[PDB]
């Protein structure tokens, strides 16, 4: 379930007491919080700085075209 | 840790769930019943076990507390018998049904502070807690329990009372309906003891068919949908189309002589009562909760039925958490554990300062 | 005071640039081009603008 | 900042494919420019406009510059 | 599909965490990214 998935993610990031504390921190962060063009902008910055790597990233995005996931990834980056 | 454990108590029409905030599951679950001889008062499983020599009372039969004397006894039982804690030593988060009368909220508050002397307390709507457990603050929750079902639209953490719908059709009705059709099959399930057996058959072998008629045709021309069930005395019985005919009543209440709309139509009607600007958020976030939503196949059936009612351009998504049977309690455990929620508790100090009516401001 | 003087100078420079563009021949497009030119090349920007105009046609 | 400005310019000119092409193109003195502009004006002729352009160039200096002039010359 | 997503993630910047994140996304995205950053800070 969604609750089980959140617990699994916390375990990967991380004995039992420490895991509970990490889960509480994750829940607090979620409460506090409560696409293609963006990828292209990141590629342009890479090209300015390299060019071959930027071309590969553009090709991978085209193959993928999920969106939400991509956005998340971008944010992380 | 400086703080003692906070308690989470989910008051259910049929079963109460109790435990400690921070835990992943309730520590105890027991029948919302109090019994007295036909030890002076019996509560929970014991009342059920010795029902033969008792007169049973159901103080929260349809989600709303109707007898506070017995509800107080259920809470006493919860603290001292089930959780083995002293309420005056722990903050307590309680759950309430959607559309709970304002006066009832004040009564619950007064009882916690004056009768149990809780150091702090809070009351949250059941459906809202289930939504929280799914990681959302916006969406519509279809909560189907034992004695009542509700469709509750929630936006930004706030339930929308004007759009909430109550359906007096839930697990209890389905159990009795199964007893009726199994009896029509040639068996005989009519007694209170037999009701418990059928409730078990219901929870273990029933399912929601994707298409009622097709499923009926399959069961009529073959034995492919039949399942065996063994009674305690060894007799093995067969359950056929009753497996899906039972929960079908949720979608077609007429099978029970009820004119009410099915759960799919009720969910749709609630959404239509909300501001047009948030309806798409509700359609894309329809969350199922409660024991009666545990039937295999119910999520796909809801998806199909809602899609038929909503505009063809609408994105429909039904969320059915594997742990939805206890999502209310789990949502309470999550909420009571939040850093930002600590300032939200009603303290004994605040209660002494403003009285019972403070609950309306503190627990909006 | 100093900020107001800077704003007046920027407005005067933009007006002069617009007059030069009219002679060699909008204002919003020129402002975006001027900001890009200041950052950093010029020949490449002209080629991109010509291609965009062809696509619009 | 520069990427955002380029996206805004593409939007004003007009989508995602065009923006990607512009990004790829992006990834790929003053006295001389003024003389070239005067020569272009002479070819167009006309003479009066060239005199006005010289006065305008002096005004801009009174109130980087080479790059802006080159872009204007390319548009012609 | 999942392998292609992993390659894109590597260029932007483990595999098990990405799979768990993808499942959560399938089951908002900006909030999830903030939670991951907070967890990393807590681990530090
Ligand atoms: N797996 C299941 N399938 C179908 N019904 C179930 C299942 N598990 C429990 N139930 C039914 O769910 C009801 C209790 O659910 P619950 O949400 O706890 O209700 P409440 O809060 O009103 O007491 C009972 O009618 C029970 O028979």
Author numbering:
A (entry chain P): 3 to 16, 30 to 49, 66 to 80, 82 to 97, 107 to 118
B (entry chain U): 2 to 39, 50 to 375
C (entry chain S): 12 to 36, 40 to 54, 56 to 72
D (entry chain R): 8 to 21, 28 to 41, 50 to 84, 89 to 101
E (entry chain Q): 24 to 36, 40 to 53, 56 to 72
Q: What do the authors report?
A:
The γ-tubulin ring complex (γ-TuRC) acts as a structural template for microtubule formation at centrosomes, associating with two main compartments: the pericentriolar material and the centriole lumen. The γ-TuRC has a helical shape consisting of 14 spokes, each containing a copy of γ-tubulin presented by the C-terminal gamma ring protein 2 (GRIP2) domain of one of five paralogous γ-tubulin complex proteins (GCPs). The GCP proteins interact via their N-terminal GRIP1 domains in a specific order: the γ-TuRC core harbors four pairs of GCP2/GCP3 (spoke 1–8), followed by a sequence of vertebrate-specific paralogs GCP4/GCP5/GCP4/GCP6 (spoke 9-12) and finally another pair of GCP2/GCP3 (spoke 13-14). The inside of the γ-TuRC is lined by a lumenal bridge composed of one actin molecule, as well as two α-helical modules formed by the microprotein MZT1 (mitotic-spindle organizing protein 1) and the N-terminal extensions of GCP3 and GCP6 (N-GCP3 and N-GCP6), respectively.
